[model samples]
Target: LRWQWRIYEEPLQEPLTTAQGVWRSRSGIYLRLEDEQGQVGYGEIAPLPGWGSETLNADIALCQQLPGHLTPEIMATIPEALPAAQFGFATAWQSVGRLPYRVRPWPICALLGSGQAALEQWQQSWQRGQTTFKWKVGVMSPEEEQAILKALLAALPPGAKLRLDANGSWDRATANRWFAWLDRHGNGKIEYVEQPLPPDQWQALLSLAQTVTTAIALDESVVSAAEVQRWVDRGWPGFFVIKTALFGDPDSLSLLLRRGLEPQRLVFSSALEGAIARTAIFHLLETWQPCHALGFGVDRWRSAPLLTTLTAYERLWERL
Candidate 1:
């Protein structure tokens, strides 16, 4: 087998603001693998600011060593700390001879931007058949956020579910206030709030989970299957936001799924990958069949054309 990699920068349509900061452009390494028989596979190693993985340059440096070490054994020697690089290699390896799996149109949640026009945005999204929506909180004052939430809930289409992501920007008191408001006004239309406080505030999260009527989801906090296992061991209630692109080996993830990781408790999210990696994530979702709506509307951030055409892959291969 032969392997090669290159760095690609994908500009976002608009600046993506999270509690961590703003992301204007996405930069990462793209991996291509070819076998003696002339078959090909593609993978991406996009990393985000707060995922705790190695920097993009370090990931590229590690990937530079991967051409000569393409075997599963050599790949296993790669550390989990370099998750993006490990994922790139693992997905590229898995892509070999993997026929496309068919799945029904997966339900995806649309992101609702904050401000005076949010309700109009919600109506537009509803017209587009989006039954689920995700909103970012903790960027505004609690009162202001609550006002927006109330308006959204009042205007929510029947049977539609709303998800709020705090990005770990709130304190326990503020989290409780929001949770209390959800109890009073959510009317079972609110799905959950994600990462209400910092990732390290495990006890606070636990308490909030027990106290709230709405469900809770952990995103920035749980990065690996090991951490998920710890949550299971400790009986941490609520859902897990799994970004398969940031996790360890694909095989290990499959093993965990088979070992009874509850599909209903998982919400698979995207890492804002390009066409190649986005397709890879879709493949992962097909394999897992998570019961909840996917958090893949991050695709809205990418302005690049989808390069899944056969010609596009061939052209990328030529560059390799």
Candidate 2:
């Protein structure tokens, strides 16, 4: 078998607003492994250091330190702190299972641009039949955002679902205020406010879940099995947003689902790592259907060339 890897940076259509700051591009490492029969498999190591996953530079450094050849021992040496890298290498090694899962499209939430940007952007997706939508909030003033919230819910089409993600930027008072607005504009179309408070505000998060009419989906809090166990034992009142790439190996991730992760309370999301990771992720979704909408922003920022078939994997690998 042969192991190869490369770094890729793709430009986003527009700068994205995150809690850390503004992001203009998305970057990651693509790992490739070829079997003795010459069949190939690909994996992506997309890091979100802001979300507590390994940074891109750390992943690169680890990749550079690896031998030209790969072995089980070398793979085992990868640290848990580098969970992003662990998934990259593990999925690459298990490339045989990387085939597309099925023919049907996913019941996914189309990620919308922030605030007013979403007002227009959601319309485009709505025309394309994307019913579920997600938007990152707290980018503008609370009053300004609250105004947009009214305009948003008013203009939303019937049957269109919406979610607002704060990415843990709110204090208890601000969250309470927003939850108040959510109640005032109550509708079935409005789904939930994501990360209403910082992950550190565990008790308050639980409180918001109980006190508010709007549902809360914890993006930063429920990152791992152990982390979610804390909520499961404590008895969380809302949803768990999961980033599967930052989770360990595929087997271990599947084990988390098999063991005790609340399925209906879970939202499966991935970093925007082109076709390879999307393919791998979609495969698992077919087996275990999570009740909530998906969060990968594939449409907001198209990365590299799209894949049409399993053999198209080589074309994408060759481009790098």
Candidate 3:
């Protein structure tokens, strides 16, 4: 076994604000692994601790400490705490001898701005053949956002639905108001509200899921396979917004898939990583597709123009 890796830091063109906090930069590690027979594999470790994945520093430490050669036992000892690192390692190892993956176009959900500008973005995206959209709440007063919501829904054509992501910023009262508002004005156009309450408020989230007629997608709460098992064991009846880059290795993930968890209830999303991780993730999604809509229409929020073609990844690797 042999290894070559580099750290890449990308500063956002503009400060991207979410309900939880503001992000100015995104940094991650890229892995290039070579086997004894000269086979090469690629992986990326991108961690967003805010979204419940392990910290970048922690993954960096693990990557730094590893020997050039890996052993079965060495690979087996990756603690659950290092899910981001584990994902990178597993994907890189799995990719060692695979044929080139042909990328497929999936139905993407557009992520709109947090203000009145969302309506304009919605119209443009709709014209571009997108139907499902997501808007961020908890950025402004709920009163002001209600008007924006009203107009967005009014302008939405048939078969178009919206997802409101609060990023776990709402309290019980605020979440309750939005849930009730969805009940009143929803008209089956509002798809679901995402992470209205923080992840730590597990009981509250469960209660709210039971309380509302509309669905709630848990993104921040279920970061790893263990968390998914916890929620599943407790009988979560809603959707799981899976950030594929942060979720741990597939073997642990398959435990639930082999269990009572329904394959149709998962929604795949990106964690704003670049082409390496995105390509790796899409390979995993090859097994699961045609969901409501993928959470991948987030190019505007990215730090730079993506290396769109698969061939360009070698350039990204060389540049880093």
Candidate 4:
């Protein structure tokens, strides 16, 4: 097989602010694989700050060397530190088989802005048939965020669910404060709060999960499927926010899903990949078939036509 890669950097329409920092753009690479029979497969190498993926330069260097070393054994030998690269290779390998999976229209959660705009976004999402909304907390004062949360909850339509992602910025006190406020006003509308504290603060996370009525989801803390298995072995009661782009091989992830994860407790999210990568994620989602809303509402971040269509994958093969 032969492989090639292309770099991409597209600015977001609006900067994405999280507890970690601001993201003005999405940048990554597309890994293309071609066999001797001229069949093509695609993968993405987009990495986020806290998701345990390697740097873009590192990924580029490693990926350049990968075309000559494409094998399942080499793919599995990749370190967890290079998850984005491993994911690209693994998914590309899966794509070569061209196996079909069930594809249904799944509802994706809308990411709402902070402050007053959040309510408007949620309202807009409702108009667009999006029943699940995700908002980032820990960007403002807990008191201010509480007000916004209350307003959003009060305005939530029946059967709509809210998801909160703090990006691991809260302390115990702030998390507790939010929990108390949710207890008073959330009215069972909150689906879960994600990564309420820093990744290392497992005790605090455990306590919050134990005390709150709302579900606690581990995002940044749960880096790999192995970590998920560790959490399951330790009897941690919470939901998992898995970014399929930051995992190892597709087969291993499938195995983990079959053996360790429960469908209801799993939420699959994208790592803000380009069209090629996004198509691979769609295939993974089809194979796993999670009922929860996905976190792939990132089309607004594309500044140019950096392969932002499903047809791009087919076009890639045609070009190959």
Put down candidate 1 lDDT per residue, 103-181, tens digits, no spaces.
Answer: 3568888888765556777777778788989888887788887887788888887899988888888988889888888
- Candidate 4 Cα errors over 4 Å, as ranges: 67-69, 97-102, 303-311, 314-320
TM-score of every candidate: 0.91, 0.86, 0.92, 0.87
Report lDDT (Cα) of residue 39, candidate 3: 71
Among these predictions, the greatest lDDT belongs to 3
Candidate 1 stretches greater than 4 Å from native: 67-69, 99-104, 303-309, 316-320
How accurate locally is residue 7 in candidate 1, as Cα lDDT from 0 to 100? 91
Model 3 per-residue lDDT tens digits across residues 77-185: 7778988888888888777756256557778898887888887888888888898999988888888898899988988999998999998889999999988988888
Sorted on lDDT, best first, the list reads 3, 1, 2, 4
Could you tell me which residue pairs clash in candidate 1? Answer: none
Candidate 3 segments exceeding 4 Å error: 19-21, 303-311
Give a tens-digit lDDT track for model 2, residues 1-320: 67888888888876766556888888898998877777777788887657675688988999889888778898899877777788878877776544533534667788766668878878777787788898778888899887887888789888889888898898889989988888886678878888988988999999889888889988888665557667877778788887777765666656755766567888888665677777766666767766776776565565433355766887777888
Which 10 consecutive residues of model 4 have the lowest summed lDDT? Answer: 302-311
Which stretches of model 2 miss by more than 4 angstroms?
A: 64-76, 97-103, 116-118, 140-144, 224-226, 304-306
For each candidate, how many residue pairs have backbone atoms clashing (under 3 Å)?
0, 0, 0, 0
